[PDB]
Amino acid sequence: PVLFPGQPFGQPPL
Amino acid sequence: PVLFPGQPFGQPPL
Amino acid sequence: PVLFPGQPFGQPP
Amino acid sequence: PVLFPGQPFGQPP
Amino acid sequence: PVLFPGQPFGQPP
Amino acid sequence: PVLFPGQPFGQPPL
Amino acid sequence: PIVQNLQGQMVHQCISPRTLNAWVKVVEEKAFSPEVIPMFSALSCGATPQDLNTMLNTVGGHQAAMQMLKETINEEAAEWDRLHPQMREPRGSDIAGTTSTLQEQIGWMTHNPPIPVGEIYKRWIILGLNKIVRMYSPTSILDIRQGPKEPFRDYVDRFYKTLRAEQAATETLLVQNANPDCKTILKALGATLEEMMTACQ
Amino acid sequence: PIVQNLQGQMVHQCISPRTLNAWVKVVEEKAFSPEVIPMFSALSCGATPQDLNTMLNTVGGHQAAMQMLKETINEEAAEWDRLHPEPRGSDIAGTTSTLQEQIGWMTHNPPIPVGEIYKRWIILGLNKIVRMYSPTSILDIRQGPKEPFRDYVDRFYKTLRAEQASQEVKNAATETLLVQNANPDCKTILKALGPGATLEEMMTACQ
Amino acid sequence: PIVQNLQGQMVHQCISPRTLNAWVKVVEEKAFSPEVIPMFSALSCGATPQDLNTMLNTVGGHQAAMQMLKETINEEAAEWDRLHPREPRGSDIAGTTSTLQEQIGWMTHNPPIPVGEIYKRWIILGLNKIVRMYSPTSILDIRQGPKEPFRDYVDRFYKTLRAEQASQEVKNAATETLLVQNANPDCKTILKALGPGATLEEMMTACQG
Amino acid sequence: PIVQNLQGQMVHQCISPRTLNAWVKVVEEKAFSPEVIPMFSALSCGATPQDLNTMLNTVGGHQAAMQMLKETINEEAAEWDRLHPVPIAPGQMREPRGSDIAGTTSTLQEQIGWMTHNPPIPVGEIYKRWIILGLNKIVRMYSPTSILDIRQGPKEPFRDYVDRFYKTLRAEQAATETLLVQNANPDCKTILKALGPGATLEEMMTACQ
Amino acid sequence: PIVQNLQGQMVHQCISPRTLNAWVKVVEEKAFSPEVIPMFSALSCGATPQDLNTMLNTVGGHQAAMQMLKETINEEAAEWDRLHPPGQMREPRGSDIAGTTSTLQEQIGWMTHNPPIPVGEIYKRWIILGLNKIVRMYSPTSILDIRQGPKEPFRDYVDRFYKTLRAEQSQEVKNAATETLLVQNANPDCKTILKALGPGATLEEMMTACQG
Amino acid sequence: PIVQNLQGQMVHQCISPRTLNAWVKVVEEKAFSPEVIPMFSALSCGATPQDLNTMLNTVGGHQAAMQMLKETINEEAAEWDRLHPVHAGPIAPGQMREPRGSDIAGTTSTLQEQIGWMTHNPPIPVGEIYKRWIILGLNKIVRMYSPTSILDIRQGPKEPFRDYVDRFYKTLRAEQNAATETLLVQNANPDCKTILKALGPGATLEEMMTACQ
Ligand SMILES: O=P(O)(O)O[C@H]1[C@H](OP(=O)(O)O)[C@@H](OP(=O)(O)O)[C@H](OP(=O)(O)O)[C@@H](OP(=O)(O)O)[C@H]1OP(=O)(O)O
Ligand SMILES: O=P(O)(O)O[C@H]1[C@H](OP(=O)(O)O)[C@@H](OP(=O)(O)O)[C@H](OP(=O)(O)O)[C@@H](OP(=O)(O)O)[C@H]1OP(=O)(O)O
Ligand SMILES: [Cl-]
C-alpha cells in the first residue's frame, strides 16, 4: 500500500 | 429608443 | 442529448 | 473661490 | 529631541 | 542551548 | 478563464478563489433574482466552458433549476448542430464542455479568429437561467396595483421589478393600475416616468 | 475595464468580483444618497459600455430608479443621433456595439471615449434620481434651540447637497439662509462676527 | 500549484492562504455534499501531488472518510503499478515517494506527465465514493407530500438523485417512473393531463398553484 | 493613483475598490478623530487630485467638515496663485494654477502629465498637503476637551490618566512640561517630585503603579 | 519567504498580511489539532528561518507548547551540531538554522546558493517535529480506550477511531491497531459481522456491513 | 515599503490598505500583548521610516505608550547623532548625504531621501534602523503593561497542569532569568509538585507535563 491507515497523505514510508 | 422597459441594460435590439 | 437528467455539467459520456 | 459652497470636490465650473 | 510630546511621528519641526 | 525559556524564537544571543 | 499576459497572447488561468466563492455565495444569497444573471456573466468573464461547468457544478441545491438548465443546454446544443453541421468547428457537446478537453477549448478561444465557445456556452446558460427567473417570478405583471396609501415610487419599484422577472404594453398598464388619486394626475400628464413620479410624490 | 498594463499599453480586463460587489453593496446600503454617484464613477474607472451595463444590471430592486435611468439614457442617446447623423447612440449605450468594437473605439488614436460618454449619461440620470429622492428642502433647515451649531451646519449642507441647484442658488442659500435660520442665541453672534466671516470662524464662535 | 508566468513558462507557486482556507471551510460547512467535489477540483486547479496532500491533510475530522480515501488511492495506485513499469510509479503520483521538484519535473515537462491531474483523478474517485456512502436518503423515499410545493419536491428529488450517483439507465428510470409517480394528488393529475414527454419546466409551471 | 509598474515608468492606475471602501469605513467608524488623518494620507498614497476628490466625495455626511475643508482648499489654492503666477515650450508642460492642483480645472491626463513629468510637478502631493491641513483644522475644532481639564481621578490609575492626557493633547495640537505632574494625584504628585525634574515617562509611570 | 518571481529568479519577499493572519487564526481556532501541522507547513511555504520565527512569535498564548517547541528545537540543534564539525562557504550551526545566530542575508545566502543549504526547510522540519510532539501530548484519548457504543452508529465510531489514531502517531502500533483494534472494539453485533467478512475486508465493505 | 519587483530593482510601493487595517486591528484587538511586537515587525517588512511613522500614527488611543515610544526614539536618535556627526557641507555627486537621527525617524527626511538610502548600493537601512528603535521602545511598553507578576502564577487546586504551565510561560514572556525551571516546579499543585520532584532534576517540560496529565 502507498498509504497506510492513520498516516498522513504524502507521508513517505519508513 | 435604445432600451425598452423591463429589458436589461445593453440588451441588443430586435 | 448532451446532458442526461441528473448528470453533472461537463460530464463526459 | 476654487470650490463654491455646496459644490462637490473637483467639479468643473 | 526628534519628537516632541503630542506631535505625530514623522512630524517635521 | 539555542532557545531560552521565555525568550522569543530567533532571539539573538549576548 | 482566458486572460492576456505581457504580450498580445491569451493564456489560460485557473478560476479565481474569489470567483468560485462569489458565485456560490451569490446563489445562496439572491437565489434566482434577476440580478444573479449579470452577476454570473461578470463572474464568468473570460471563462472557458470547463469553468462554466465548474461554476454550475459547485451549486448545491436548486437541483430542479439545474436540471431545467441541462434541458435548456441540450436544446441550444442540438440547435447549434442544426445551424453549424481552417480548424475543426465544435459540435454542440464540445461547446457545453462534455466532449471537448480544456486544451481543445483553449484552442478555439486563443485562435485568430477565435471561435468563442465560452461566450457561446455562456449564451446558452444565460438563456436557461433567464427561463428559471421567469419561472420563479411569484406574481404576474397583470397583478401589481398601486395601494391607495402606497407612494407611487414604491409602486413603480414593485412594477418594474415584476416586469423584469416576467421578461407600450407596460406604458399602458403601469399608469392604468395606479391608485385613483395618482391615477388622475398621471392621466392628466399625457410623458416621462420622472414627470409622473414627481406628479405623484 | 480598459486598464494600463506593465508594458504601457491599454488592454481589456475583466471586471473583478471585488468591483462588482463593491457596487452592489453601495446600492444596497444607500438608496441613491448623493455619495453613491462618486462611488459609481470610481468603481467604473476605465469601464467599457459593456461593464457599465453590467454594473447597472446587477442592481436588484430600485427598478423605478433603473427605469428612469434607462429613459435618461434613451434621451441622451436620442440626442446623440441628432447631433450626429462611427459610433451611434445605441453603440455608446452598448446595445448594438460589441466588446471588440468598444475596445477598438476606446484604444483608438485619437481616442473615442464611448465608456466616458456612456458614463456621462449614466451619471446624469443618477443625478436626476438623487434629486427626485431628496427628502428635504433647504428652507426647512433651522437650528434647534439646543442643537449645536455644528450639527445644524451638517444638516444644512447635507440637504444642500441633495437639492442640487446651480451655485448661484447654492451661494444665495449660504449667504442668507444659513445665518438667518440659526437659533437666536448663536444668530446674533453671526451678525457680530460680520457678513464676511468664514465657516470655521462661525463654528468656533458658537462652540 | 504550477501556474504560467509572463515568459510563458510553467513555474511552481506556493498554495495560497485563500485556497487553503476555502477548502477547509467548504469541508467544514458542506461535509461530503456532492458539490464539495467540484469545489475541490477547482480549488486544486494546477495542484501538485504535494498540494493535494496538503489539502487533504488540512481536513480535521472525517477520518472514516479520509481512511476510505486512502484505500481508494491504494486501489488506484496498485492498479497503476500493474499498468505501468523516468516514468512515475503509483506512490510517486500520490506524493509519498516523490519530491516537490520531482513532481514539478513530471508536470513541467514536454510532454507533461500530469502526476497532479492523475492523483486528482484518484482523489475525486474516492470523494465520489464518500458522497454515495454518506448519502442520507434513498430516491425511493422522496415523496412530495400534501403541502409541499412541487418545486421544493423536485429540488429534493434531484438533490437525492445526484448524491446516490447511480447508473444513467437507473437515473432515467427514476425520473421516468418514480418522479411523477411519487407526486401529491393535486399535481400528479395535472401532470397526467400533460401526457408523456413533458419537459421539467412544463411540469413545474403546471404545478405552481 | 500614479504607481510604478515593472518597466519603471509611472503609470496611472484606478483607485481600488479596497482603498475606496477603506476610506469610507474610516470616516464612518472614526469620524474626524486625529488618527483618521494619517489613515487618509496613507490611503491616498500616490493619489492624483482626481483620486483625492473621489475620496472626499464618497463621504456621506460630515458636510460641515466637508465645507470647512472646501474653504481651506480655497485659501491654500489662492495662496498658490498669488505666489505662483502662470506660451509653453515644447519640452514642457503648462503651469498648474491653484484650481488645477485641486482638480477642478485640470484633466486627469494633465494631472498624470504633471506627476509623471521629469522633474515631476507633484500636484497630488500638493493637493493632499492642502486637504490634510484642512483635516487638521477639523480635528482641532472637534476636539471636545481642553488640555487644562484633564486631572487624575482619585481612584483612577496613573496610566489611564496619562492616556487621557496625551490623547487630548494630541487632538488640540511645550505647555506640558509640568502640566502633567501638576495635575496628578496628591499621592502620585509627591512621588513624581521625589524622582525630581527630568524623570522619563517610563520612570514616572512605573513609579505610580 | 524566498519565492520565484515573474522573471524566474529566486527572490526574498515579505510575509503577507493574509498569511500572518491565517496562521494566527488557525492556532487560535484549532489549537493543536492534528491538522494544524499541514496548515503550518503550507502557510510557511518557502519560509526563511526568520519567517518561521515570526510565525511562531506571533502566537499569543499556547506558551507551554511554544516552550516545548523551544526545547525540541534545542534538541535538534544540539543534535545537528554533534553531527556537523578555498572559497568554501560556512556551513550553518544548529543555531544558524534556527535563526538566532544568523541574519536574513545569511539565511538567504544558504538557501539561494549553488548548492543550496535549505536552512528554512531544515528549521521547518524541526518545528514540524516539535509540533507533532505537541499534538501527541494534547490528544484527549488513547487509542485503546475507543470503543463503539452499544447504540452508536458504526461510522461515528470509525470517525472517533481514526481521529484518535491520527493524533497518537510511530507507524508500528497503528497498522496493527487498524488490523486488530477496530474490529475488536466494535459493539457485539457489528464485531461478529466484521469477523464474518474475514481479513482483507475493506473499510468500505465494513461500513456498509454495519450501516444498521 | 521598499520591495523588489519583477525587474529586480528595489522600488518603492505604497503601504497597502490591508497592512494599514491589519496593524490597526492588532493594536485594537491585542493592545501591547507581547505577540504584538513580532506582528508589527512583520507588518512593517520593507518599511520606510515614513511607513513606520504612518503605522504608529494610525493608532487611536494608547497615547501614554506612544509618548514613551517617542522618548525611546529620542534617546536612540541622540546616540546616533553623537556617534554619527554628519559631515555637513556639499555632498559629492552621485552620493547621498549622511543621515542624522531625525532623518532616520522620518521627521527631517523626505520619502525620496529615504528611498535613496534604502536602495543605495550598499543600502543605508534607515528603515531597519528606525524599526530597531521602535521595537526597542515597544518592548519597554510590553514590560510595563504586563498585568500579572510571575510570582503570582500558582497552579490551582482543580486547574489542569497544562493550563497552569500556559499561564506561567505567558506571563514569563511579558517580563524580560534563571528562576524558570525552579519556580515552575515550586508553584505547582501539591499533588503535581510531589510528582515533579519525584521525577528528579534535569527534566524536560514535555516530561513534566505528561507526569501531571
Ligand atoms: O470586509 P468585507 O469586504 O465584507 O470582506 C470580508 C473580509 O475579507 P477580505 O479582507 O479578503 O476582503 C473578511 O476578512 P477580515 O476583514 O475579517 O480579515 C473575510 O473573512 P475571512 O478572512 O475569515 O475569510 C470575509 O469573508 P467571510 O464572509 O467568508 O467570512 C470577507 O467577506 P466577503 O467574502 O463577502 O467579501
Ligand atoms: O486581485 P487584486 O485586486 O489585484 O489583488 C491582488 C490579490 O490579493 P487579494 O485577493 O487579497 O485582493 C493577490 O492575491 P491572489 O489573487 O494571488 O490570491 C495578491 O497577491 P498575494 O496573495 O501573493 O499577496 C496581490 O498582492 P501583490 O500585488 O502585492 O502581489 C493583490 O494585489 P494588490 O495588493 O495590488 O491589491
Ligand atoms: Cl525586503
Author numbering:
A (entry chain M), B (entry chain O), F (entry chain R): 313 to 326
C (entry chain N), D (entry chain P), E (entry chain Q): 313 to 325
G (entry chain B): 1 to 85, 95 to 176, 184 to 206, 209 to 219
H (entry chain C): 1 to 85, 98 to 219
I (entry chain A): 1 to 85, 97 to 220
J (entry chain D): 1 to 86, 90 to 176, 184 to 219
K (entry chain F): 1 to 85, 93 to 176, 178 to 220
L (entry chain E): 1 to 176, 183 to 219
What did the published study say regarding this structure?
The cellular proteins cleavage and polyadenylation specificity factor 6 (CPSF6), nucleoporin NUP153 and SEC24C contribute to early steps of HIV-1 replication. These proteins engage with the outer shell of the HIV-1 core, which is composed of the capsid protein (CA) arranged into large hexameric lattices as well as into 12 pentamers needed to form the closed conical structure. NUP153 and CPSF6 mediate nuclear import of viral cores. Prior X-ray structures have revealed that short phenylalanine-glycine (FG)-containing peptides of CPSF6, NUP153 and SEC24C bind to CA hexamers in the hydrophobic cavity created by two adjoining CA subunits.
Here, surface plasmon resonance (SPR) based-experiments demonstrated that 15-mer FG peptides CPSF6313-327 and NUP1531409-1423 bound to CA hexamers with Kd values of ~71 and 131 µM, respectively, which is consistent with the previous results. In contrast to our X-ray crystal structure, which shows six CPSF6 FG peptides bound to six hydrophobic pockets in an isolated CA hexamer, our cryo-EM studies reveal the differential, sub-stoichiometric binding of CPSF6(LCR-FG-LCR) molecules to extended CA lattices. Importantly, we note that short FG peptide binding to isolated CA hexamers seen in our X-ray structure, and CPSF6(LCR-FG-LCR) binding to the mature CA lattice in our cryo-EM map exhibit different stoichiometries. Taken together, our results indicate that LCR-LCR interactions, which are lacking from the substantially shorter CPSF6 FG peptide used in the X-ray crystallography experiments, dictate the observed pattern and stoichiometry of CPSF6(LCR-FG-LCR) binding to extended hexameric CA lattices. FG peptides bound to CA hexamer complexes were generated based on the X-ray crystal structure of the CA hexamer+ IP6 + CPSF6313–327 complex and placed onto adjoining CA hexamers in accordance with the cryo-EM maps. The 15-mer FG peptide directly binds in the hydrophobic CA pocket in agreement with prior and current biochemical and X-ray crystallography data. The CA peptide fragments that exhibited statistically significant protection mapped to the FG peptide binding hydrophobic CA pocket and its immediate vicinity. These protections are shown in the context of our X-ray structure of CAhex + IP6 + CPSF6313-327. The structural results 6 suggest a key role of Pro residues for the 15-mer anchoring FG peptide to adopt a U-shape needed to effectively dock into the hydrophobic CA pocket. While the crystal structures have suggested mutually exclusive binding of short FG peptides vs LENs to each of six hydrophobic pockets in an isolated CA hexamer, our cryo-EM and biochemistry experiments reveal that CPSF6(LCR-FG-LCR) molecules engage only a subset of hydrophobic sites in the context of biologically relevant, extended HIV-1 CA lattices.
